[PDB]
């Protein structure tokens, strides 16, 4: 994983978006293309929309979802059985 010494991968674009949102102290739906960003608990009230190769999916953040990458919560593959 992203080892300790390096520090996490919290990409600058949505870092800047959330800096905007928490400097305004209001929280809105957000659209982003970055599965690869790991999570800080700063996002718990924030709301993100994330891409599935096809569309977006707005999703709300929570305490225990930290330490994860958002794509864990964006379903990539549909499978329905046979």
């Amino acid at each position: 994983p992203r080892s300790l010494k390096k520090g996490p991968f919290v990409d600058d674009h949505l870092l800047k978006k959330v800096d905007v949102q928490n400097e305004k102290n209001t929280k809105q739906v957000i659209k982003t293309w970055s599965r690869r960003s790991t999570i800080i608990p700063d996002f718990i009230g924030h709301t993100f929309a994330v891409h599935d190769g096809r569309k977006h999916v707005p999703v709300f953040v929570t305490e225990a979802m930290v330490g994860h990458k958002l794509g864990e919560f964006a379903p990539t593959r549909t499978f329905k059985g046979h």
Partner: peptide
């Protein structure tokens, strides 16, 4: 759950 300590280990 102990994420306050997760991000004391992670900084």
């Amino acid at each position: 759950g102990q994420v306050e300590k997760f991000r004391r280990r992670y900084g």
